[PDB]
């Protein structure tokens, strides 16, 4: 294809994308296909001659869309939001056009320089401690990572390298592997699976800190674990504290665990992948208090700040531990896209106030769902509602709640996922779509309430 | 922004992208900016009120473009090609629209199922051994990785887990760390830096195998290293054999090293990030002979098969070592985009024959540059020209060749990068742009020849 044909087909794709978004409420949010549906519908080999664009777009509607889970339908209330905004789509078109691979500054200066400035923009929007910002010859700085999972791995590997070098300086009689079998990392029992995967990749032990009644990491539980593991010969070196847990959107107490990690020389990484976007709002900034004690901080613009995946924002206090010219030792890959264009377009076309209004609308809708649940004494709220997540369940057995979830997700009118809080099976209601409104939340609750009546009926009859 | 405004701005962006591509030969390929140019030109904080799309696109032209290295200019002859095709751009627009995060099959079935079929399409285009393909209940299969660097790390981690489990089964008295200090991985002395980074992340030793006069790994050098390291107590467990080295596009001898790795129970990973795309052409498929001995194989569609970054294709013979429903234990992150749409659009809109013509044109242009160099006895060809890379230098000192490279890259009419072959400073000429023609290569050589006269003059005067 040459540029003249792209002028035609590109504008046709723009109209197709806009049509899909405008009619997305007519789509069944979760598909009815079963695993392996697609292979019989597609030829077994690539075509030798080109297919037409009309043939391909027809296939998108006829065989791809039936197997799509529509994350951006207003009736998608599963996991956490993923970002979809037209400013980011426009920047992504330019990103593929410039098409640079910014593994070095010389590979494309603007790709690296815009990223450094955008991470300062975002750090200032979150009122991060100045030690995390790159402006004005600070030793800290920020980088875009592909994902919060990758950011947690990068922080673990940096912590691993630092503790090995420290221990080998103290006792030069020590091999790297001899230190390896002693290292232990920590996280909450509510931590995302990315922490376990990072520990497995890094080759170190990982232990969960028991959370309190609010499912938060506290100083008392951390001190109890440290007392045990240090007496056993383990060397704590890395901690993932979570702000906005994937299970119930709980918050580890950084004001308590931060000072302890500093005193113990434990690298403190803060995982705020979802909740971090809300900290641009002054009424939620208190949830980030204690980040001044952290060695690294991370959240995902590509969940809930409208910067299409991939875009994970990671700050560190000392870049040496990982002017910014190179981004090589900051990430796991060497190559990277011009992803800072997406942040630049989104921040500029929405403004800080536009992003704040987006966050506040979602949190308002979350409290609207909470209000409806709190009006039905057959249900209970399991964790305090703070952001765009509500954890709820039918009072009674785990089975009756499992039955409710299966009934909901099988109806495929809305989509939810559950979690386990201790031994308790719990349903999650997450505000996700950019275009969700009060009417959608009210309809979803009516659906949930009707299926609960069926399921409660079936447990006595 | 709502969809109606995206209908306008999206088509405006289509025209901007098409205008940039059509006039790209009027751009200076490498920028004149210096590190840190951008911060003074951009405000220090994000705007509170939205900026206009007109203001942003004006800034793209005025402050972003001056700091862009134009990888898709026909005069970009540096590193290796990176992919830019309009079919991939169209699919990427749809990918951001569907906006699924396919960490599981249920997260969006089509995102996982199309990927499995496209990796079979591509595996069949390369005439890969059937053990690598997923179709027909085979134990092997393919996955898209973010980069060849990530693919090499994934293979190393899989090899690490397998050898630990094997050694602990043989001697249950062994800790993981006790095995760690003995493990050693191997690669050519021409290997990409991704191998060293993978060994550092994985916590294992890495040793380079000396290459022969053609800069290829051979059985004799590998057997000599194994004899030494096994006697020293090291346990070989992982090997990266390279087809199309980053330095000089040389090829490790898989027919020799493959059987050795199998006999030694060394996981054989084949890194063919650049050269792999040419193996869809029957006249180059012989360069892949011996891949039947490999445990994993990887190449980048996002270098030289027109699938815009990111798209790295990795096959394994046993998926257990990492029907396909989940792609979690295949990669380093958990989340992923609908990147298989790009392969589907490119393969269908070009056809196998269109992609073959693309490869063959680039290789023809490479031989055209080689022909010009071979007509000037002041120069020498350092390595056999096989694909889209030519390694050449002025006969004489390393200094005179360093001076030639500085003179070229400072003129900023074309862009080249060098390499070191043993103690020899060598210039690289890589065919990169989708739209490069014979006239561009002929102009570049005339430029190189003129600057060589200046530099040779300056070494005697």
Residue numbers in the entry:
A (entry chain A), B (entry chain A): 1 to 322, 342 to 480
What did the paper state?
We then transfected the DDC‐KO cells with two AADC catalytic variants, R347Q and L353P, which resulted in loss‐of‐function and an altered profile of dopamine metabolites. By combining several structural approaches (X‐ray crystallography, molecular dynamics, small angle X‐ray scattering, dynamic light scattering, and spectroscopy), we determined that both variants alter the flexibility of the structural element to which they belong, whose integrity is essential for catalysis. This change causes a mispositioning of essential residues at the active site, leading, in turn, to an unproductive external aldimine, identifying the molecular basis for the loss‐of‐function.
